[PDB]
Ligand binder design. Structure first.
Ligand SMILES: [Zn+2]
Length: 193
């Protein structure tokens, strides 16, 4: 099977938002609207905003999952490479095999799907004075990792779910985990032009 990647705002007007971090060679995470693609360094904080037009019910959750972007690879489970899955960089909560972690949320749950074997991380659902909520993700392998992503592009799919896991909303973005996100974004954006 292959998870749907179709954008779906749903009843609550769910969609993502990204900061404007620029493309300085020092930057650790940067998002390209033109490419709908996030470029980030290994294991660095990736702030992703969650926007809604109205507040979803108590018990609503937000799940993240990675899939390969190319159709010929889409049935393969995205996982950490043979090196990184064994490097004992556990935060005590994320399984060592999971590519995507949520940073600084003790209520994060990590799922190994019993049927598809795919990995995901899910958190429960702004503060006073704020207009959106932000989740902080980490990507724990480089796009280039041999025996893992192996230079294949991935997408992250973010789904808004009810307490049963039923779909309420969906958005997605491509991700490249690389040493120099600023330069790579600049390069790919120029290539697109
Ligand atoms: Zn790796």
């Amino acid at each position: 099977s292959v998870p749907s990647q179709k954008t779906y705002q749903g009843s609550y007007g769910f969609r993502l938002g990204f900061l404007h971090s620029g493309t300085a060679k020092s930057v650790t995470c940067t998002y390209s609207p033109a490419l709908n693609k996030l470029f980030c360094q290994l294991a660095k904080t990736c702030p992703v905003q969650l926007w809604v037009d109205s507040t979803p019910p108590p018990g609503t959750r937000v799940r993240a999952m990675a899939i390969y972007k190319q159709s010929q690879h889409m049935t393969e489970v995205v996982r950490r490479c043979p090196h990184h899955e064994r490097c004992s960089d556990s935060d005590g909560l994320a399984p060592p095999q999971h590519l995507i972690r949520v940073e600084g949320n003790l209520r994060a749950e990590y799922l190994d799907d019993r049927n598809t074997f795919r990995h995901s991380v899910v958190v429960p659902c702004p503060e006073v004075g704020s207009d959106c909520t932000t989740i902080h993700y980490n990507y724990m392998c480089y796009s280039s990792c041999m025996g893992g992503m192996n230079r294949r592009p991935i997408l992250t799919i973010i789904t808004l779910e009810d307490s049963s896991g039923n779909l309420l909303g969906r958005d997605s973005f491509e991700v490249r985990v690389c040493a120099c996100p600023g330069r790579d974004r600049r390069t790919e954006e120029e290539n697109l032009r």
